[PDB]
DNA sequence: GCATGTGTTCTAATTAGAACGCATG
DNA sequence: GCATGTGTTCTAATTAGAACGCATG
């Protein structure tokens, strides 16, 4: 038989790097890793974490057919478009077709040209990625163009963070059952620095904004140190989401520089389980 | 040269199919939100495919057309090997602004002709792989006055003698009269 | 009969850099009683070392009483501030004023903390601070430890200058400096992936930011990306010796960080100061 | 701490720092007027041999120069010289005959200026009036300084009086007397 | 010579927390 | 019923920029 080859990877809106974090954490080999990301402190944070391994195309609306197809093909292409102008935590979200909301339609054309040829029965696999907080018509438009309805995939199986999220693709078992494991942390306790103590086991969906990490409408602080209670650090929010701690300790970024990217990021552990399937179509360590 | 089958989205180009020379076998699609590749599928083949933005003044964004023509017309083409000429396009009653005007010639990998209604007068871009459209240099005109022609004209309407004048070289490949 | 786990007393903790090197050169801790009020120091600490620092709060509430009990230590160790020492400030108050008398309190605790007469029970101290402070403060701080310093610049042993006087008896103080093969001289060797240094070596890093700009014209010390940038502080912490990330806790800002690191020591230097400690204690 | 019969008491050695308390000893005869006491002022480069060579003494004594301008050094150098020089002297553990010291102000350090003082000399001051003649601050080991409640007297009140002397002797000599059951008495 | 320096005090940049605001499941 | 949220604008309160300094090798 023949030998299962490296993946190729096109990944739009690439923020930090999660979806090449994860495929490295599954031993899968990787060829090329191609993203297309505009946030200088996002292009800093992949740079650096993995040593220029990814080739940065910059705006998607740059990338053409003819680009698609020469850089191809790709085994697998992922996504995850800005959802500010999509969700209903924004109330001046200009909708699915103005804005930034219009950006998921580079996705959708992308894919379309990454697709491979009517004949051409090669393993090819896809994932898009955005809220559940979005609008009913901007949900089924969405799977209208995409021709596919979502997974809603709720971080809190898998971490310590509640993060309903729905999940266009293809991706192999993309709805069995999630289960833990060993290496994932389900409580807070176990992501805080130490000699600081979890008051919860969860914590409410975090984002870019500050106090979203007060859990309730009444402002609860999730953690004691000392005499005194406190926020969650940026190191202890990585560890949340799953990220290596310090992975977003780059360029000087502020703490809230770092919230923000994480805050748009993906769940790592919930990537991590969408992925485990490609292991047995491409070559691993 | 058989006859053509050919869908109409947002406009209802019965007006001036007859005219131009061409149960009944057009299909005319209204609210396309619910469409799916296998009603357009088994609305049977076709050989043209048009679009069409409202004329200005009336509701709903103007690349909404604009995504949903592209959507459609992807579920429209045939196999790469199949030899019936197919055609298609896109039209624009200068409602589009500079942003979505880049967005629909990146989407569909061609720029626009404007077209003039000078004897200006009225004008419309669209976009199409009739190499008749590309081949036909048309009187040139602006944006500064098609800029200046929008503000009035909304002050206060599909003028297809344009468009009929348009997609009359596409006759060459199916049935007159 | 056995060597036992050493038991020290640092004055001006800062960020615990007196631990940092006692764990590194194997050498095991009895105890590690600190004397530090910036939270933001005392965080460091209590995340980097697990709750195995004992904080005593501000230096100018320690007893005798205090050292009595929570004694016998037999390192001592401190660097008070030097903030109306050095010569940068042009408004210093000098040894006698401001935070300069908290020198003082060094003086009367190591005092406190020294064994009796007859007693030859081994005992060590170490005091640091700058060169560029007055002839006359220099003066007076060697006639208060009956000791004068020995002058180490940390460019021998890492990237970046950092001239300091050291007063202590510990053994070989001033045996001469050899770059160990783990030591990084280059600031090419701290920096991040991607990034090419402008510079072999660094001046002195103070608190302030723009002491990274190097020379009398202010030069950025990095390109990355064909463009000038500053250091950034996980390889200010590389230029000084710690772990990268150390002082990443508490949702601190590179220039609070580098306030951290701007006031404390060079980790090559302060590992080879300790080195013959090795012997005096249980090394595990 | 336990006194000695008079042929066994010998005459003080004394180290005065700052002041001059010769004609202070001479009033209440610590000395002979025929000329064992060391004074030195500036301090600055004294080192501690310096000291030990000096004689083995008996009272060290230091004092903050008096209200005025004669104030060149800052006031808390004359604190901690003061007991830079006090472990200096200071005799071993079997301590043979007694020792004594004590620093004095008159009033010219504030209030932090009084705390470290009583830090670095680990007791609170006394407050010897002349009653509102007059007042002085003093840290000593003299159990007789320390016990004998002299009377209360306000920090307002001290304050004015340390700036009365600002705008514009024997019955302070009280801080000496508990010594000469001690030394010598000189006829 | 003269540049170097465990820092101040000033200007303008964020930080920041609060204040919205309601579809949706 | 109810609150939960990959956000934006803001305004007070902080934090992060540029000059002044001159012993001292
Ligand atoms: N025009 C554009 N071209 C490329 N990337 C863009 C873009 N507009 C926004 N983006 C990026 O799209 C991202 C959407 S949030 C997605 C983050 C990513 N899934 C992660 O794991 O980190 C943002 O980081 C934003 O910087
Ligand atoms: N009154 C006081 N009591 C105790 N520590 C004090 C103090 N005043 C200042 N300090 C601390 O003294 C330190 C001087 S800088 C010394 C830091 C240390 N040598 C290191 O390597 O990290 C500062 O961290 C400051 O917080």
């Known amino acids: 038989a023949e030998k299962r080859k490296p993946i190729r990877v096109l990944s739009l809106f690439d923020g930090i790097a999660t979806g090449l974090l994860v495929l490295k954490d599954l031993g899968i080999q990787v060829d090329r890793y191609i993203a297309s990301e505009v946030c200088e402190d996002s292009i800093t944070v992949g740079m650096v974490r993995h040593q220029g391994k990814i080739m940065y195309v910059g705006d998607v609306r740059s990338v053409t057919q003819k680009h698609i197809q020469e850089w191809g093909p790709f085994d697998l292409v992922i996504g995850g478009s800005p959802c500010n102008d999509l969700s209903i935590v924004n109330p001046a979200r200009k909708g699915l077709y103005e804005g930034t909301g219009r950006l998921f339609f580079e996705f959708y054309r992308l894919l379309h040209d990454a697709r491979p040829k009517e004949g051409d029965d090669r393993p090819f696999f896809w994932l898009f990625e955005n809220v559940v907080a979005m609008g009913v018509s901007d949900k089924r438009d969405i799977s209208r163009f995409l021709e596919s309805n979502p997974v809603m995939i709720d971080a809190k199986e898998v971490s310590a963070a509640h993060r309903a999220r729905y999940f266009w693709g293809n991706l192999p078992g993309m709805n069995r059952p999630l289960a833990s494991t060993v290496n994932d942390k389900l409580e807070l306790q176990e992501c805080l620095e130490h000699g600081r103590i979890a008051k919860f086991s969860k914590v409410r969906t975090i984002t870019t904004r500050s106090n979203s990490i007060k859990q309730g409408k009444d402002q609860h602080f999730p953690v004691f140190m000392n005499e005194k209670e406190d926020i969650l650090w940026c190191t202890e929010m990585e560890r949340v989401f799953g990220f290596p701690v310090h992975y977003t300790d780059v360029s000087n970024m502020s703490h809230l520089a770092r919230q923000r990217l994480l805050g748009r990021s993906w769940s790592v552990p919930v990537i991590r389980h969408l992925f485990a399937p490609l292991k047995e179509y491409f070559a691993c360590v | ?177």
Request: charged residues 25%; glycine residues 4%; proline residues 9%.
């Open chain 2, 1 to 177: 040269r058989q006859p053509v089958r050919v869908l109409s989205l947002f406009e209802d180009i019965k007006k001036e199919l007859t005219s131009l020379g061409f149960p009944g076998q057009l299909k005319h699609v209204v609210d396309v939100t619910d469409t799916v590749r296998k009603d357009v599928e088994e609305w049977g083949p076709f050989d043209l495919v048009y679009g069409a933005t409202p004329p200005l003044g009336h509701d709903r964004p103007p690349s909404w057309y604009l995504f949903q023509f592209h959507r459609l017309l992807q579920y429209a083409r045939p196999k790469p090997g199949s030899p019936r000429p197919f055609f298609w396009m896109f039209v624009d009653n200068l409602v589009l602004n500079k942003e979505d005007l880049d967005v629909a010639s990146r989407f569909l990998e061609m720029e626009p002709v404007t077209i003039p209604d000078v004897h200006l007068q009225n004008a419309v871009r669209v976009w199409s792989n009739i190499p008749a459209i590309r081949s036909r240099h048309w009187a040139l005109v602006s944006e500064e006055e098609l800029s200046l022609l929008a503000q009035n004209k909304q002050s206060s309407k599909w003028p297809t003698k344009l468009v009929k004048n348009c997609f009359l070289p596409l006759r060459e490949y199916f049935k007159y009269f």
